Amino acid sequence: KETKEVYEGEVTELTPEDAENPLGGYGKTISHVIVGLKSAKGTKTLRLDPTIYESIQREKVSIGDVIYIEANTGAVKRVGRSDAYATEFDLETEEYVPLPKGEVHKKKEIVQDVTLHDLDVANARPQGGQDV
Amino acid sequence: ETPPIVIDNGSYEIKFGPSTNKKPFRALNALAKDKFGTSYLSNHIKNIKDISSITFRRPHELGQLTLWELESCIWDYCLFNPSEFDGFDLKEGKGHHLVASESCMTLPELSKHADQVIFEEYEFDSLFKSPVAVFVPFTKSYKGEMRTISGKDESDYHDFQLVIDSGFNCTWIIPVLKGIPYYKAVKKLDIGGRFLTGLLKETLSFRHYNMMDETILVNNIKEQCLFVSPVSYFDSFKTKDKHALEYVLPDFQTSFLGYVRNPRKENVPLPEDAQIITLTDELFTIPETFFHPEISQITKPGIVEAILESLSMLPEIVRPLMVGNIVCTGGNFNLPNFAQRLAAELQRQLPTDWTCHVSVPEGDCALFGWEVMSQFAKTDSYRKARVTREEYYEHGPDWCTKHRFGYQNWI
Amino acid sequence: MKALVEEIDKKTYNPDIYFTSLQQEILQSDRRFMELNTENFSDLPNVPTLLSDLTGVPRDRIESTTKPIWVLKPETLREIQLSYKSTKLPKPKRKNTNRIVALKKVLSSKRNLHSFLDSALLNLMDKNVIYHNVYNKRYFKVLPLITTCSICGGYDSISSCVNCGNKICSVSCFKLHNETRCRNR
Amino acid sequence: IEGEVVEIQIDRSITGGHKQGKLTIKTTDMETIYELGNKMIDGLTKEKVLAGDVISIDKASGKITKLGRSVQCPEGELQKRKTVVHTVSLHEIDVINSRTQGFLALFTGDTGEIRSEVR
Amino acid sequence: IEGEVVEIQIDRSITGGHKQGKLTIKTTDMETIYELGNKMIDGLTKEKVLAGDVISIDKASGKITKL
Amino acid sequence: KLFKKNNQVNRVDLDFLNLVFTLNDKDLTSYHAEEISKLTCVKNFVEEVNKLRETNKQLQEEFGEASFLNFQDANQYFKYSNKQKLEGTVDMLNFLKM
Ligand SMILES: Nc1ncnc2c1ncn2[C@@H]1O[C@H](COP(=O)(O)OP(=O)(O)O)[C@@H](O)[C@H]1O
Ligand code: BEF
Ligand SMILES: [Mg+2]
């Protein structure tokens, strides 16, 4: 049995923590990009890990495109650019998609059955990852 | 005279009837004369045969009414004719009281002329000149059939109601509190029934021959087969092939009104020599202009922009109270699967913590509006609300239309 | 595929270059809206005066720089009167003294710019409240905009015209566009 | 999307990028100008093409294929909607899913002892 | 050395160049303020801590672990 | 592309479940893990829960029968305030639990 958190919405903000107070130790800047998750039904500014922002950079997202992130793993997948930017380009390889309906923060539970030796091989050998 | 008279004027059609009967009497508000010059009474254009070239001369304009004598002539016809109005009877109307509706944005001088005329020539013993949105929160005073739509889910009168009102003249948005609408948050939609008729005429000219001369046919086709897109535009466009309707035009000699032949039904097998104009693409495109005015290539903001502006500038505490009660009134709200789309797109556009809750009345919403004004008279507040002749007489004529019936009073 | 080594010049060549060879619109939108809001053919030429009066721009200049595309008569009063002559006729009234003498100047005034402006009776501030205040200011657009075929609304194939820039989708739309909707051709 | 080109005109910045590529595409029955996105004009810079050259454009992949010069006589609609059908044994998909190196493994045969749970 | 940090103040602009700032470290039973050397300035430059955080530093090797 | 169908609905991360310890020894001393495990500080979220559901239950006992009702909260100057306060305190409650 397992439970995770669901998030969706389009992207407008690519800014780190401003950190107005220097404190004498910070040339204020961080590899933690604060993004206001612009879903049509909700918006929240998140301090994001360098890994999830690195995956954001992997998708090379721009302003105005739906994103999907995870609270725990931070997995980043984009359905594509929004239909608002469809008229900007007469042609574009990136698919123009509408914003999926639903709240920003959604919670789902799984009771998936996994055999013992899949966990055996995963523990003996890590399965994989997007990082170098 | 305990039962007053209920008159609900309109730029297109005026709703009128006594306080006793349930169903209001109907009469179009427009004067039409044929190309040969034969004028037709407003209730008799439906009786004429030649509907090809008709020029309409209505006293109402895009904003309001101007011709006082022609409109007074219209009312004199509509309230002095018991022979053609069964059950109705009104000889002179001294003690008979009036329940009159009007726009929230009446001009000072035009309102002056209107109140002067109604008080001094029609001797209304007492009357209440107020917009429909004021009578709207009195719906809870009576129990009856009423339907509601939820956006999220897949005294004797209420206070916090959001009023959406659409008519042939125009469309308006009104937030009302304690029974007095929030005037500064009331906004107007420029798209009216006349604009819809004109754009249908233009699209038909671009897709068929010229029907700009025809006007009754365009209203008939926009009234009998136009429906709102249930979900969006692209799905309807892809499914417009199966959602294809063919309308048989009315031959002037045998059929005064045409019929829409549905291919899916076999109940109409008789063939006709008259040509049939097929319709597959414009069935849902026209109502999509409300959500997406850009499909008509117009620079209007849109319904969602207006509602979000009105709510945002409105005080924050009563915004959820506003969106907790939405009711649709007017003729244009009779289109199918429309307010469900409004609820869905509000819920998409409104924050999760808020809940969208729009209630829809069955059938014509203008009839429900007439019903609500009629039942407003039964309320114990109306007898306090009505203003007599003398208070108009001794006081200056501007006082009655500026203080109690003046929009500047509650601004 | 791409050649690893390619010809590169210094004078004509530049990394960015890649060439290989062998207000008014708002006025148009408002005018098309208001003329689409007008039904009678005889009412088409007179409403531009209404547009100019409301907008405040000079009528003659915008009329020359923009190409688009009575009700009351005593005899009409007479035939309308006889139409419902079954029951008809209210009573007006008049009085004397300086107040009614002044009211003569407003009773049956018969004033009209085209229908009714022609007055200082409405305040300029009230005029701005009526016209310039009701319309929204900052919310130009919130929802996405969709552009489809100007002929049939097709959107799968998007292709603007080369002369007038009009969007066309199908071959039939293109072939009927050039001679009818392509004014620049 | 397959049709002969008329000219190629890419808008851009000398040092800031801001690439806006445009090029008219012609055939036997259309003469249409197209605004090209960043990827397509990046490719068009990758492979050298000229105005008279004809290329084939696929929306999803964004790849470009040119075969001849005014050699080829294109016709028909630009937005030709034709399917691509691919046959394969389940051995190839098994090898691909077994390992990220399975591509070259099946291209070279140095596979071996695939887990039966994958099967 | 285990202790929750209270505050860190380094004069990195008035004097700069590892001004030997002072950081206060608290525990549930005792609290003291610890001087920071130039090499300690460089060490705290890595594994950056904005205080309000429980960290521990080995007494011998001087290696700070952010818990 | 035929293989990248939605699997998050039926996949276990197994990394957040601290079962990938073979990679944990790369950057972890034994005593640090021993001391960070014993500092599994319970009742710190529970004390916030306790300080919040006092107000939650007070509001529920005050206007929990009408503020939560859609009809009453539709037209009421202060009852919606109770409704939204109850929703907010429940939201902070389950977020702190998460
Ligand atoms: N059942 C219906 N289907 C489609 N359109 C309708 C229907 N009923 C009314 N309408 C539209 O509503 C308009 C009537 O507006 P109305 O509310 O009567 O204006 P007013 O407020 O001046 O009375 C007409 O132009 C008509 O096109
Ligand atoms: F007065 Be209208 F036709 F809305
Ligand atoms: Mg009306």
Ligand SMILES: [Zn+2]
């Ligand atoms: Zn088309």
Ligand SMILES: [Zn+2]
């Ligand atoms: Zn053209």
